[PDB]
Write a protein that holds these residues in place. Sequence first.
Motif, PDB file in Angstrom:
ATOM      1  N   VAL A 302     -41.490  -3.388  -9.567  1.00 40.50           N
ATOM      2  CA  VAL A 302     -40.176  -3.837  -9.999  1.00 40.50           C
ATOM      3  C   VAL A 302     -39.872  -3.230 -11.345  1.00 40.50           C
ATOM      4  N   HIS A 303     -40.913  -3.006 -12.159  1.00 41.57           N
ATOM      5  CA  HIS A 303     -40.718  -2.693 -13.578  1.00 41.57           C
ATOM      6  C   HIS A 303     -40.356  -1.203 -13.682  1.00 41.57           C
ATOM      7  N   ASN A 304     -40.485  -0.446 -12.558  1.00 47.71           N
ATOM      8  CA  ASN A 304     -40.177   0.988 -12.535  1.00 47.71           C
ATOM      9  C   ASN A 304     -38.715   1.271 -12.156  1.00 47.71           C
ATOM     10  N   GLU A 305     -38.007   0.275 -11.590  1.00 46.04           N
ATOM     11  CA  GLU A 305     -36.638   0.450 -11.146  1.00 46.04           C
ATOM     12  C   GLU A 305     -35.689   0.492 -12.353  1.00 46.04           C
ATOM     13  N   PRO A 306     -34.906   1.587 -12.527  1.00 49.21           N
ATOM     14  CA  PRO A 306     -33.972   1.733 -13.646  1.00 49.21           C
ATOM     15  C   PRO A 306     -33.234   0.485 -14.133  1.00 49.21           C
ATOM     16  N   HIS A 307     -32.486  -0.150 -13.232  1.00 49.74           N
ATOM     17  CA  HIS A 307     -31.619  -1.251 -13.595  1.00 49.74           C
ATOM     18  C   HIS A 307     -32.421  -2.385 -14.215  1.00 49.74           C
ATOM     19  N   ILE A 308     -33.699  -2.493 -13.867  1.00 42.34           N
ATOM     20  CA  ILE A 308     -34.540  -3.582 -14.364  1.00 42.34           C
ATOM     21  C   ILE A 308     -35.062  -3.175 -15.716  1.00 42.34           C
ATOM     22  N   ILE A 309     -35.316  -1.864 -15.830  1.00 45.80           N
ATOM     23  CA  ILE A 309     -35.786  -1.301 -17.083  1.00 45.80           C
ATOM     24  C   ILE A 309     -34.701  -1.482 -18.130  1.00 45.80           C
ATOM     25  N   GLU A 310     -33.477  -1.064 -17.810  1.00 45.52           N
ATOM     26  CA  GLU A 310     -32.454  -0.927 -18.823  1.00 45.52           C
ATOM     27  C   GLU A 310     -31.978  -2.273 -19.325  1.00 45.52           C
ATOM     28  N   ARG A 311     -32.069  -3.308 -18.536  1.00 40.99           N
ATOM     29  CA  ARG A 311     -31.588  -4.594 -18.968  1.00 40.99           C
ATOM     30  C   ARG A 311     -32.718  -5.493 -19.457  1.00 40.99           C
ATOM     31  N   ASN A 312     -33.983  -5.031 -19.516  1.00 37.11           N
ATOM     32  CA  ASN A 312     -35.127  -5.881 -19.894  1.00 37.11           C
ATOM     33  C   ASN A 312     -35.128  -7.227 -19.158  1.00 37.11           C
ATOM     34  N   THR A 313     -35.049  -7.137 -17.831  1.00 36.92           N
ATOM     35  CA  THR A 313     -35.147  -8.346 -17.049  1.00 36.92           C
ATOM     36  C   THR A 313     -36.559  -8.916 -17.242  1.00 36.92           C
ATOM     37  N   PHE A 314     -37.508  -7.991 -17.512  1.00 32.63           N
ATOM     38  CA  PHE A 314     -38.906  -8.361 -17.666  1.00 32.63           C
ATOM     39  C   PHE A 314     -39.474  -7.962 -19.032  1.00 32.63           C
ATOM     40  N   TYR A 315     -40.601  -8.590 -19.398  1.00 33.86           N
ATOM     41  CA  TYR A 315     -41.365  -8.243 -20.587  1.00 33.86           C
ATOM     42  C   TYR A 315     -42.823  -8.307 -20.174  1.00 33.86           C
ATOM     43  N   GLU A 316     -43.698  -7.614 -20.932  1.00 34.51           N
ATOM     44  CA  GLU A 316     -45.093  -7.340 -20.617  1.00 34.51           C
ATOM     45  C   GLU A 316     -45.935  -8.350 -21.355  1.00 34.51           C
ATOM     46  N   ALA A 317     -46.797  -9.086 -20.662  1.00 35.59           N
ATOM     47  CA  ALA A 317     -47.579 -10.090 -21.356  1.00 35.59           C
ATOM     48  C   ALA A 317     -48.838 -10.353 -20.543  1.00 35.59           C
ATOM     49  N   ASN A 318     -50.011 -10.507 -21.182  1.00 35.36           N
ATOM     50  CA  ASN A 318     -51.210 -10.930 -20.456  1.00 35.36           C
ATOM     51  C   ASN A 318     -51.499  -9.937 -19.303  1.00 35.36           C
ATOM     52  N   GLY A 319     -51.906 -10.348 -18.094  1.00 33.76           N
ATOM     53  CA  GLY A 319     -52.126  -9.368 -17.023  1.00 33.76           C
ATOM     54  C   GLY A 319     -50.993  -8.327 -16.920  1.00 33.76           C
ATOM     55  N   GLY A 320     -49.746  -8.820 -16.744  1.00 32.41           N
ATOM     56  CA  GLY A 320     -48.569  -8.006 -16.424  1.00 32.41           C
ATOM     57  C   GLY A 320     -47.240  -8.705 -16.753  1.00 32.41           C
ATOM     58  N   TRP A 321     -46.268  -8.676 -15.836  1.00 35.03           N
ATOM     59  CA  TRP A 321     -44.893  -8.915 -16.232  1.00 35.03           C
ATOM     60  C   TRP A 321     -44.473 -10.373 -16.099  1.00 35.03           C
ATOM     61  N   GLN A 322     -43.667 -10.880 -17.034  1.00 37.70           N
ATOM     62  CA  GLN A 322     -42.874 -12.052 -16.765  1.00 37.70           C
ATOM     63  C   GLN A 322     -41.372 -11.800 -16.905  1.00 37.70           C
ATOM     64  N   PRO A 323     -40.526 -12.704 -16.336  1.00 39.65           N
ATOM     65  CA  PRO A 323     -39.088 -12.705 -16.598  1.00 39.65           C
ATOM     66  C   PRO A 323     -38.704 -13.133 -18.011  1.00 39.65           C
ATOM     67  N   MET A 324     -37.851 -12.291 -18.593  1.00 33.28           N
ATOM     68  CA  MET A 324     -37.194 -12.632 -19.837  1.00 33.28           C
ATOM     69  C   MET A 324     -36.241 -13.782 -19.581  1.00 33.28           C
ATOM     70  N   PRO A 325     -35.906 -14.582 -20.581  1.00 31.70           N
ATOM     71  CA  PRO A 325     -35.028 -15.715 -20.355  1.00 31.70           C
ATOM     72  C   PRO A 325     -33.707 -15.358 -19.742  1.00 31.70           C
ATOM     73  N   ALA A 326     -33.194 -16.375 -19.060  1.00 26.84           N
ATOM     74  CA  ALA A 326     -31.898 -16.295 -18.446  1.00 26.84           C
ATOM     75  C   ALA A 326     -31.284 -17.687 -18.540  1.00 26.84           C
ATOM     76  N   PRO A 327     -29.960 -17.771 -18.564  1.00 27.57           N
ATOM     77  CA  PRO A 327     -29.141 -16.549 -18.639  1.00 27.57           C
ATOM     78  C   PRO A 327     -29.127 -16.110 -20.105  1.00 27.57           C
ATOM     79  N   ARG A 328     -28.251 -15.154 -20.433  1.00 28.55           N
ATOM     80  CA  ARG A 328     -28.109 -14.580 -21.759  1.00 28.55           C
ATOM     81  C   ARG A 328     -26.779 -14.959 -22.392  1.00 28.55           C
ATOM     82  N   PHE A 329     -26.830 -15.222 -23.707  1.00 31.02           N
ATOM     83  CA  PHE A 329     -25.765 -15.655 -24.605  1.00 31.02           C
ATOM     84  C   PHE A 329     -25.392 -14.538 -25.592  1.00 31.02           C
TER      85      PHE A 329
END
Lengths: 354, 354
Positions: A302-329
Amino acid sequence: MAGPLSGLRVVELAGIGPGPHAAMILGDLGADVVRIDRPISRDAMLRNRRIVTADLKSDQGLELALKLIAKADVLIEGYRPGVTERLGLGPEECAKVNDRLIYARMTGWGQTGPRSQQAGADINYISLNGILHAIGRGDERPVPPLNLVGDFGGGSMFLLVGILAALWERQSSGKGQVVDAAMVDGSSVLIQMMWAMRATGMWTDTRGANMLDGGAPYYDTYECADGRYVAVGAIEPQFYAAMLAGLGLDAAELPPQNDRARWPELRALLTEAFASHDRDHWGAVFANSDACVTPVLAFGEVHNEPHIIERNTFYEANGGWQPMPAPRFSRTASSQPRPPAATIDIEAVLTDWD
Amino acid sequence: MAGPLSGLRVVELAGIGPGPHAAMILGDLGADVVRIDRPISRDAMLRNRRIVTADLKSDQGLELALKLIAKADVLIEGYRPGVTERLGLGPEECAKVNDRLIYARMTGWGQTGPRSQQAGADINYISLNGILHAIGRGDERPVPPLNLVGDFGGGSMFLLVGILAALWERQSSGKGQVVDAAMVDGSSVLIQMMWAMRATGMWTDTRGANMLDGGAPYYDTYECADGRYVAVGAIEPQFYAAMLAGLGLDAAELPPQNDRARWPELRALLTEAFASHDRDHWGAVFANSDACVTPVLAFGEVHNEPHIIERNTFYEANGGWQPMPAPRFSRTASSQPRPPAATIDIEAVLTDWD
């Protein structure tokens, strides 16, 4: 702590699944969340929290919980009805010491009613109100949609709406109240579209034979040449046509989009089409289309797909990825969630809180 | 109007699926919601609303929208990024006339980024962030969980949480702001449990081979004698054992609950058990135990089930059942929803709004 709930003070009574997911999203959004356990977590769900321990059976933990609750705007608990009551942390107990408390109760079956004492998980809560029945292919027994529907969509999300609504109400009554979040109820309003649809014949109790369950050839997945899938969401006729174009199929040689009688011939045509090339091909065919054609990505892609990259839907932590908070203000934005940090002395939090 | 958001004032810009579902729940909860269409609805999703008409293309309707928005606490919009901007209802325009406005934007892909101008539905948004991959039986291609995950659980519910949080933030900044609720992001945080679990080996990108996706014999559906289903959610060993006793099986002739190596033998044994009798037989056997075994009810059968009856999870309207509001508030309770209401002259609402 950044985000819009900066300032809000939440006490969570450690339990499983929905309750923490709600506590988490509050945290995500800036609340100061304090979770009471029994006596580091490498569970991420426990991000954006301080953890304390107490023994709510003993005179001395009981007493420290109330000190916390007294300073708090919100309490989350997700045990069997009657359990906080018997510990003496019930709603009437908390009210004595803080009548501004939003007392959020998170259960499957609800506070009252015949089932209200019985165990259950997500699959049972959605078994009873129609939702699970409707999920799956018609030739096969219903399939669980993970615990997405009752635990979260229909559980934690409705707890969150209950909490944040009751907070709006307090800002002119000046009192709080109890929110009874039951998954059986919350999931029902989640699926209210189907209930509406059933009444005008735009949805049927028959499984796998509707517009959004995979009965429709233009709203389903297709296996590709390489064994992987694409997702087709082309309901609107203009979208559907941009889909037929990318496939290079002629409208004239095909059944019409909505001649359900010939939906098998249309599906076979689409199947043969999509299987004739790998997934990634279809990505390039349909890049910048309204064809509503997308690759079905596995979590680990998932983390390789452009649209996910550009909007930082995810962040890198511990083993691998979690979702960044939603929604956004736009103005008071959330920031990267803080990892679960080691325990904290409960006294030091009362003292933080004054 | 009853419920906790009584007082709150919402303008909804008519569109499809997530955005109305959000406006609905606000309505359910007491808000005064006002929906602007183009020039009675048979759709219940449009309950707890007043409907009005304007051509936002013309200077006449543009100008009346702004009068409404100017008096309103919340605006909901579900169109493409750039669309309200070009109509002249963008965020910066609304700020001119109402800087207290919570400007809630409901999209699949978000406000910004490579896909933000492409069409899609629920199935596309959950194709891209791993969710759809994970749903279904492993010997068959992913199955859509209706639009429960992207449109609602990860769409409207996160718009709701964004709106109600921004309201809390306003109550001390005294300004509003824009919420960017994208389904791709909202559903990711919805399935955060899986993301966490992947990083400790409690979840696999392999499909149909996990604890909550139907790989576990004790968390899945079983076909009964009569072709109908029960749901088994018996994860906890005490739950599982109450289940084995209801079926009348010797614990000691069964493979261990978590000898995955023999999960096929366990499932065959359970399959055989449950097919030996009709659904309703099991429904009775398990109507009180903590075996986490329940009948899988079709939507059309729901209103007859005791627990549902006693809690009024549903009410009747338009020759069929809809869900009552959720969650439930002990002091300022929601009422039975008002049905859609024929159109109204928009000037009369401006007037009603002081």
